[PDB]
């Protein structure tokens, strides 16, 4: 019966269900996690100069 | 895929769509050739003596 967390992929949204306490700590937790990547990702491409790919 | 793999398929992408260049290549092939063939022989002949 205690708050429960969640998220869909085709809008990318964070469900919760539960308290209001719930709705102030998982706020701070969708904005925790909502950081995007700085310059270097996963991926990389790499531009060989002298070796064929 | 997932809004984190978007952003990381849009930098691959733009790597990858790099204005290719392009390259002149001239080849250049120079041959040159020649000889000399030489025949001088002398042949005499005798109906007395004899024929070589």
Redesign the interface.
């Known amino acids: 019966l205690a708050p429960k967390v969640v998220a869909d992929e085709r809008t990318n949204s964070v469900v919760v269900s539960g308290e209001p306490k719930a709705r102030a700590r998982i706020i701070q937790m969708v904005r925790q996690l909502d950081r995007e990547l700085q310059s270097q990702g996963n991926t990389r491409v790499f531009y060989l100069k002298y070796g064929k790919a | 895929a997932?809004?984190?793999?978007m952003?990381?398929?849009e930098?691959?992408v733009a790597?990858?769509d790099?204005r290719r260049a392009q390259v002149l290549v001239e080849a250049i092939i120079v041959e040159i050739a020649d000889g000399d063939g030489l025949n001088l022989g002398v042949q005499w002949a005798n109906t007395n003596g004899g024929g070589t």
């Not at chain 2, 997932?2 to 793999?5: A, E, G, R, S, T």
Request: no cysteine.
């Open positions: 997932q809004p984190d793999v952003a990381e398929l930098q691959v790597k990858l790099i």
